[PDB]
Each structure stands twice: as structure tokens, then as C-alpha cells.
């Protein structure tokens, strides 16, 4: 229904609330 | 199916049917044939030197039967016998004529014979 605008979907609640990430390294 | 003096055909408007795939050279028992290709100007390949020695050739019928593009063909003319061994060695541009002197002979034999083999 919103053709563009994945933004807040991706960047609003997800951006702050996707902790940590640690995710490590893999420098390589 | 007779065997004899050699030729090199060409299609309708002429291509010098030989592609220089270096075969009629490599099945030759006697090793008469000698071939040197080198890429022609457009980029389609053809020959430069092609020499059948006419003393060594043992008349197999191995060089009529290995050519996939179906160029080189043993003619049915026993015209021969010149007086100097400096001669019978052939170049390319002796052959073609000797094979364009009669193509009414040749082009009407194969279409009798080619249905068997």
C-alpha cells in the first residue's frame, strides 16, 4: 500500500531496537 | 569410381573449396601432400603452398575420402607423361586449372557415386 517508504519500517523502530549487534569479526 | 589426375573444385562463385584443415595431408601413405596455410586477408583461412608430388603418390583413394568439406578429388583423365621430372611436382595454381579444365567431367561423376558411400 505504501509503494516507496520502507524507511521507518527499516529505520525507525528497527534502527534503535536491533541490538547490539555484536556480530564479531571477520576482519578478514 | 576411377582414379587419376588431381583437381581442386570450387563451389558456385568460387571459394577455392579447400579450407586447409590439414587432413588429406595426414592420411597420405606415401606422404606426397604438402600444405602451408596462413590466414587470408579477410580472416577466412586458406592455403598458400599445396604440392602433390605426382611421382610419390601411390594412388590410394585415401585423399579423396578424408576431406570433410569435399574439395580434393581424383580426376578421371589420364592426361600425363611430360618429358622432364622437373615438372610433375605440382603447385597449387597448376592444380586448380587442371581441375577447372573439366568440371563437367567431375561434377557429374560424384552424383552418380556419392549415394553408395
Amino acid at each position: 500500500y505504501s509503494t516507496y517508504t520502507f524507511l521507518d519500517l527499516n529505520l525507525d523502530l528497527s534502527k534503535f531496537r536491533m541490538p547490539q549487534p555484536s556480530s564479531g569479526r571477520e576482519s578478514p | 569410381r576411377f582414379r587419376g589426375e588431381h583437381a581442386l573444385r570450387r563451389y558456385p562463385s568460387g571459394e577455392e573449396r579447400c579450407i586447409a584443415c590439414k587432413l588429406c595431408e595426414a592420411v597420405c601413405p606415401a606422404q606426397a601432400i604438402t600444405i602451408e596455410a596462413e590466414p587470408r586477408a579477410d580472416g577466412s583461412r586458406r592455403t598458400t603452398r599445396y604440392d602433390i608430388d605426382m611421382t610419390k603418390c601411390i594412388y590410394c583413394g585415401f585423399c579423396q575420402e578424408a576431406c570433410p568439406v569435399d574439395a580434393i578429388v581424383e580426376g578421371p583423365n589420364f592426361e600425363f607423361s611430360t618429358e622432364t621430372h622437373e615438372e610433375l611436382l605440382y603447385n597449387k595454381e597448376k592444380l586448380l586449372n587442371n581441375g577447372d579444365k573439366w568440371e563437367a567431367e567431375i561434377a557429374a561423376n560424384i552424383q552418380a557415386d556419392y549415394l553408395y558411400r
Binding site: 500500500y1 519500517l9 527499516n10 523502530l13 528497527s14 531496537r17 536491533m18 541490538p19 564479531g24 | -
Partner: protein, 427 residues
């Protein structure tokens, strides 16, 4: 199998559909008891599904119960993830996307409750982007709950909680295999790897992953919520459970229904709701699998129950869980070519048997249908199909021949007479 059913009550494994789409407390069914589950030792969940022993909905055997208590028992240096197909590859499947469309609140739980068994770290899902509208909403469904503090990083009551990162594809078949999806989750071109590296639980993103399916991780929480002793309800001592079938291609009202195992196809097709074509005299030429099983004629199929191993009794079984049939006007030879013309477009193209080996058929199948040069071909075309089996990496080849392999079986003459129909015509 008991009474030869497979009934449907309001007691089923799926909570609701037309009731409440949006968020909340999971007003009745869902998100009920959590902190008690997770706080007990993880392997309590492992093997506690064995009371059911779900075969899995991924189109195959290999019960889901084993592979999770399978390797990924230990852990060393590197995180573990979850990749759960949402994709549909098979024509007429349609089972998926109905789970997500009106009730997303289930699966975000299905991972969190599920992922604890893996001991995993993060949660990826995957969806064909060809669904733009419905798939777009999960993020809300994620947010509308996750925002409340239901997930992550401790939520709830444990020291272990982690969120779910949606992704998308484009022209994928990629769910056509694991060890492809975990490759195009990465961003390479998707050519599925060799199957035994290190099979799919060693070689992975950077590090071991497990590829689940939708209702394999969807129904797990509710089967660990209650379980039993009802976990095994219908179906014989081998296959047990109640899965979803979605009927398509001739019926009165083709639509999904929850139906347990061992249901015969002659009552099931007719029911839910009608048989609207001829319940008989429409010849009922049937396809058990979506694309993965060849025809059955009017023979024992109609009495043949839909239990898995019951189908291996016939010349082909089906794990796909879909139904497509025919009646009269549809010319099978005409109607199976556009099942093959499909395969030619969805194949990776690495392997020499698959590529250049499917077209050899697809190029000839437009001879038979049109009607065209003589038999004794059929005898060869069978051998081609017999010649691609151990020769391809993925299953798409092993799923390439069966439709043609099982067309030459079960219908001899329909071809033989048509090659005449054009033979007499030529005359």
C-alpha cells in the same frame, strides 16, 4: 489411522483467521506461557516434539524433530542463525502467504520459542519480494509487538532474546534448496552449492545455520505448548499430524482446509465443498504433488489416503501438500507441457545434466503435443528421464523428470493415437 479420517473441528493447530488481524495481548491463544518454557533447560524442548515427530513441510521426509537435536548440539566460536523459508516454489502451492497474511503474530513467536532450541543468535526470515503488500506488513507485526518489549534482548524473563531481520529476493527459486538460500542471503548469484561440503549445518553464512520451513516452525510452539498424546492424533504409527491442503484447478470452491493425515482423496476432493466437475465421468485425472508428482488415473488414488508412505506405495509420493486435478476438456499432454516449459526457466544452469538436459526434453515436448514425427521416440524420451537422477546437484533435476517419467507411465495410448492423428493427417 482409525476411522479413515482426518476430520476438522474448531480444535486445530491454527488459532484464528477472520477474528483479529492486528496486535494485542494475543487475546486468547498465543503468547500464553513463555517464561516457564525458556527458563527450563533447552534440550527439554528438543525431543519433546518427538511426541509428534513432524515430518516437515519442506517437501520431503526427514522429520523436523531430528535435525534440530541433530548437530548443533555443541557450540564453539561462531554464532548460529535461523533461516526459515517463507517462499513458494511450487505451482499451486499457495499454502504459504495465508499463514502470514491474516496472522503474523504466530511466527515471530515461532522463532523465539523455536530458536532457543537451536541455541541460535539472530533470526532471519526470507520472502519472495513478488509479494509486496502482504510481506510489507510483517514489519508492523514485528514492531506492533516487538516495540512493546515482547522480544529482545532479554524478552521476556530470560537472558536470551533476539530479533528477526526480514529480507527479500526477486526472481528467486532460491528456496528451491537450502544451501542456495544461505548463499543468496549473502548476495552472491545464488548457484546452490554442492550438497556435502560439510552439509548445510557446517558451511553457512559465516557459520552454522539451519534451514527450516514455515509450518515446521509455525506449529512447534503450540505443539510444545500442549503436545500430548494429542501430538500424535491421526495417521498411522509412521506419519502423524494434521497439515493444510489447498485444492486447485477443478472444484466447487477451491480453498484451504486443515485436514489430518490418511484422508482418502475421493471424500476430500468432493468435500470442501463440492466436486463441482463430474465427481465421476469427468475421468478424474489427478496430480498428487504440486509439480513434484506425476499423474494418477482413476485407479486406487481415489481410495488412496494422503498419508505420505501411502503415496510411496503408488508410483509417486508428494511432500508438497497441494492438489491439482482435471476433468475432460484439459488435454493432459497439452496441460503438462506448460509444467515443463516452466522448469526450463527456473533452473540455475551450473550442472551439465540439468542445463542442456532439460531442453532436450522441452524442445521435443512441443513435437508430441503439436503432433509430429513418429513413435519409438517415447522409448528414448523415457531413457533421458532415467538418465538424470544422481547426475544433478539439487533436487530440481530429481524434480524435473518425474512428471515426464510418470506420464509415460499410466497413459500409453493418448500419445500413440495422436502421432497417428497427424500421421493420417499428413496422408
Amino acid at each position: 489411522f482409525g476411522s479413515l479420517k482426518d476430520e476438522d473441528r474448531i480444535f486445530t493447530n491454527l488459532y484464528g483467521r477472520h477474528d483479529w488481524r492486528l496486535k494485542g495481548a494475543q487475546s486468547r491463544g498465543d503468547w500464553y506461557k513463555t517464561k516457564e518454557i525458556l527458563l527450563k533447560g533447552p534440550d527439554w524442548i528438543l525431543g519433546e516434539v518427538k511426541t509428534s515427530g513432524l515430518r516437515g513441510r519442506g517437501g520431503a521426509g526427514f522429520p523436523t524433530g531430528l535435525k534440530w537435536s541433530f548437530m548443533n548440539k555443541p557450540s564453539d566460536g561462531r554464532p548460529k542463525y535461523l533461516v526459515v523459508n517463507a517462499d513458494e516454489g511450487e505451482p499451486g502451492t499457495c499454502k504459504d502467504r495465508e499463514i502470514i497474511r491474516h496472522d503474523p503474530h504466530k511466527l515471530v513467536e515461532g522463532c523465539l520459542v523455536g530458536g532457543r532450541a537451536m541455541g541460535a543468535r539472530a533470526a532471519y526470515i526470507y520472502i519472495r519480494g513478488e509479494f509486496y503488500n502482504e510481506a510489507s506488513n510483517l514489519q508492523v507485526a514485528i514492531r506492533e509487538a516487538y516495540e512493546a518489549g515482547l522480544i529482545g534482548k532479554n524478552a521476556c524473563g530470560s537472558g536470551y532474546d533476539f530479533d528477526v531481520f526480514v529480507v527479500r529476493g526477486a526472481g528467486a527459486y532460491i528456496c528451491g534448496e537450502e544451501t542456495a538460500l544461505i548463499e543468496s542471503i549473502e548476495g552472491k548469484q545464488g548457484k546452490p552449492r554442492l550438497k556435502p561440503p560439510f552439509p548445510a549445518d557446517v558451511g553457512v553464512f559465516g557459520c552454522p545455520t539451519t534451514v527450516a520451513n514455515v509450518e515446521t516452525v509455525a506449529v512447534s510452539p503450540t505443539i510444545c505448548r500442549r503436545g500430548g498424546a494429542w501430538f500424535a492424533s491421526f495417521g498411522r504409527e509412521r506419519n502423524s499430524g494434521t497439515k493444510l491442503f489447498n485444492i486447485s484447478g477443478h472444484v466447487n470452491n477451491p480453498c484451504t482446509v486443515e485436514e489430518e493425515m490418511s484422508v482418502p482423496l475421493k471424500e476430500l476432493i468432493e468435500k470442501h465443498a463440492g466436486g463441482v466437475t463430474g465427481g465421476w465421468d469427468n475421468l478424474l485425472a489427478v496430480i498428487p504433488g504440486g509439480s513434484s508428482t506425476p499423474l494418477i488415473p482413476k485407479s486406487v488414488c481415489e481410495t488412496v489416503l494422503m498419508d505420505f508412505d501411502a503415496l510411496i506405495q503408488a508410483q509417486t509420493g508428494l511432500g508438497t501438500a497441494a492438489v491439482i486435478v482435471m476433468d475432460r476438456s484439459t488435454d493432459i499432454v497439452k496441460a503438462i507441457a506448460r509444467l515443463i516449459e516452466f522448469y526450463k526457466h527456473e533452473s540455475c544452469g551450473q550442472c551439465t545434466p540439468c542445463r542442456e538436459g532439460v531442453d532436450w526434453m522441452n524442445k521435443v515436448m512441443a513435437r508430441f503435443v503439436r503432433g509430429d514425427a513418429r513413435p519409438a521416440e517415447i522409448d528414448s524420451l523415457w531413457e533421458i528421464s532415467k538418465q538424470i537422477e544422481g547426475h544433478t546437484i539439487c533436487a530440481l533435476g530429481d524434480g524435473a523428470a518425474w512428471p515426464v517419467q510418470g506420464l509415460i507411465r499410466h497413459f500409453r495410448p493418448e500419445l500413440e493415437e495422436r502421432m497417428q492423428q497427424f500421421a493420417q493427417q499428413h496422408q
